Amino acid sequence: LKSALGDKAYEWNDNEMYLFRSSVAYAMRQYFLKVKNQMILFGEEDVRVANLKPRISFNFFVTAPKNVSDIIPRTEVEKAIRMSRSRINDAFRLNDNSLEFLGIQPTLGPPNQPPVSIWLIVFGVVMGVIVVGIVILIFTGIRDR
């Protein structure tokens, strides 16, 4: 927190863990609607949390709605969160560098916007003016022989 928000940073009481668990359940609800076309009513009690600490770094995992022995495989939780990370972030005002998930890293945005090679353009134009000069000068030169 104190890195991202710097100040104005709220404190992390259990009402925040509640919101986090509920938002993760929302993300899981969304994934099993637009990929697998099912309707699974995840709840905030299906997101088990462990090893809370000062750094606030915990572990969590998700189980089926009412089946305690049914753990959703990790490689699907890693996809639901990839889908709705941009919406989990702003719920806490964090910015993808203060809400690390340690195994899911962002990667979307390469650089290629120049259509015209501005350097070339400018160089081109400039050389023009100077050539004009070093041509016309030569003529006024033969003018005064």
Binding site: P114, M127, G133, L137
Partner: protein, 579 residues
């Protein structure tokens, strides 16, 4: 021959021929090489014994003999004809590499219209997740100056083929100088005048933007504090002296041509001081701007050595975030040893021993101190485009001025021989010179170009100028001098020369120059070989490698074919005069 005008010009031409890139570009790089306050003292000492009196001597000789840089010496003792030829060869070698600086300034100014600035962000890697490898070990700007503008190969042995972009920029720089030298020095006053006035309204803007950066006093307290330890390093003193002789132009035989035209009613003793001081002063001014901005960069680097490590600590043994600033840093670094020795034994070899004294000294070492620093203060401004345009326009203007001077110094003794100005008009002499120099300057733009530029920057000029300023003085004051010379009188009328100028350029200049010469050779000979600084991309830090053989040969030839013309001309007279 044609003359001057208003008079107030002559001194503006001298000021514009001396304020060039020897002050805003080469003096900071030098002062950084040898420790800052270990390069100033020598500077002043020199300037008050061997920089001012020889300037006064050169202007007086160029005014009384009334002729160019070769005709002036033949009229003293025709056995001394060579000195003009050496003074032309040196200026040739100088311009040949001096123009590539204007070439690089053009390249940067051209790239400074994009958005965002190309040296402000680093490219994305092979999987669009993070910056490239060289741009994390090296800053963004060092990656730009070493791998987008140069493509510098990591060894003077692994050469390549002519690059494509900086060659074209070199072509443009030579076209601009050839276009400006279309009016003959005898009348290039306008351009001269304009330079200087320009390049002074900028340095003060950067002095107001420098001295308010956060962490800009550490750089000053480094640039000024003295170390009585490097006052032994002989290369420092020979570099001080050569720095001077390169900045004023003593030996290039140019100042002579200038104090040659000008009408013979001057008061030369007050056009030497007013030049010399200003030159030196401007250099000090530049060294206060750069070594402030530079200082800021250093602090920035150090700040990160505290963030990451601390964050590193914060990540490992865990710890409530926002708890390991700077003092707390040492605090916890100490309390984590006596508490968790299980992993402290394996993390301790990692903790990056990073402290301000180093990162302030080895940050931007090299010939690009004026290119990979002034960007570290342009990528931290309000509207960076306009202000980068300003700074690089300043550099380009200074370079064009200096190059005007050099090309005039090489054309004056070529457009005087009734033989040559008989079957080649006055428009194709300048053309021939510019074409030849641009066709030879294509060796500095290969993939191993910066090393050849370092060679041509380190031996030629400096050594030649030195070895010459001695024969000049011993010619004017023990072959035909003091006597007939002090008989200046009707020339100006200043009734004499002050007995603080007779002593200084008849019995202190030669002693000190010869002493310094032997004092430098006593290190070059016993050192063994010579070492240069390569890039070594795989790490992003300059390493040192000993020169190959033929590079040593070229170092030898660049001093031989410039200080061995005087005795050859002496022999040419002694043996010509036979029948």
């Amino acid at each position: 021959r044609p003359l001057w005008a208003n008079s107030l010009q002559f001194v503006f031409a001298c000021i514009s021929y001396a304020v060039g890139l020897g002050n805003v570009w080469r003096f900071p790089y030098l002062c950084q090489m040898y420790g800052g306050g270990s390069f100033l003292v020598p500077y002043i000492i020199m300037l008050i014994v061997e920089g001012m009196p020889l300037l006064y001597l050169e202007l007086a000789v160029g005014q009384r003999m009334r002729q160019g840089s070769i005709g002036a010496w033949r009229t003293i003792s025709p056995y001394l004809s060579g000195v003009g030829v050496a003074s032309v060869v040196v200026s040739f070698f100088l311009s040949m590499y001096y123009n590539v600086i204007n070439a690089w300034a053009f390249w940067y100014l051209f790239h400074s219209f994009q958005d965002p600035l190309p040296w402000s962000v680093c490219p994305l890697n092979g999987n669009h997740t993070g910056y490239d490898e060289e741009c994390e070990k090296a800053s963004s700007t060092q990656y730009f100056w070493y791998r987008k503008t140069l493509n510098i190969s990591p060894s003077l042995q692994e050469n390549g083929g002519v690059q494509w972009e900086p060659a074209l920029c070199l072509l443009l720089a030579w076209l601009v100088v050839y276009l400006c030298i279309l009016r003959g020095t005898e009348s290039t006053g306008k351009v001269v005048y304009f330079t200087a006035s320009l390049p002074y309204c900028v340095l003060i803007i950067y002095l107001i933007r420098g001295l308010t950066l956060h962490g800009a006093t550490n750089g000053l307290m480094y640039m000024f504090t003295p170390k009585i330890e490097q006052l032994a390093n002989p290369k420092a003193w020979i570099n001080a002296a050569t720095q001077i002789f390169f900045s004023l132009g003593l030996g290039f035989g140019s100042l002579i041509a200038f104090a040659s035209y000008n009408e013979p009613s001057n008061n030369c003793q007050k056009h030497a001081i007013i030049v010399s001081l200003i030159n030196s002063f401007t250099s000090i001014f530049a060294s206060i701007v750069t070594f402030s901005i530079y200082g800021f960069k250093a602090t920035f680097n150090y700040e990160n050595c505290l963030k990451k490590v601390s964050l590193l600590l914060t990540n490992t043994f865990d710890l409530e975030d926002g708890f390991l600033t700077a003092s707390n840093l040492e605090q916890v670094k100490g309390y984590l040893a006596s508490a968790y020795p299980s992993k402290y034994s394996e993390m301790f070899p990692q903790i990056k021993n990073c402290s301000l004294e180093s990162e302030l000294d080895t940050a931007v070492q090299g010939t690009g101190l004026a290119f990979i620093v002034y960007t570290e203060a342009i990528k931290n401004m309000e509207v960076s485009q306009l202000w980068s345009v300003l700074y690089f326009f300043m550099l380009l203007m200074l370079g064009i001025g200096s190059m005007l001077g050099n090309t005039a110094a090489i054309l004056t003794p070529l457009t005087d021989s009734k033989i040559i100005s008989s079957h080649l008009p006055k428009e194709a002499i300048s053309g021939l010179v510019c074409l030849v120099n641009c066709a030879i300057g294509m060796v500095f733009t290969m993939e191993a170009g910066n090393y050849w530029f370092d060679i041509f920057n380190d031996y030629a000029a400096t050594l030649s100028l030195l070895l010459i300023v001695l024969v000049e003085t011993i010619a004017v004051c023990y072959v035909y001098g003091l006597r007939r010379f002090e008989s200046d009188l009707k020339a100006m009328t200043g009734r004499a020369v002050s007995w603080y100028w007779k002593v200084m350029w008849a019995g202190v200049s030669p002693l000190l120059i010869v002493s310094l010469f032997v004092f430098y050779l006593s290190d070059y000979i016993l050192t063994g070989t010579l070492k240069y600084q390569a890039w070594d991309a795989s790490q992003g830090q300059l390493v040192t490698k000993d020169y190959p053989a033929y590079a040593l040969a070229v170092i030898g030839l660049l001093v031989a074919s410039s200080t061995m013309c005087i005795p050859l001309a002496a022999l040419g007279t002694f043996v010509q005069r036979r029948l």
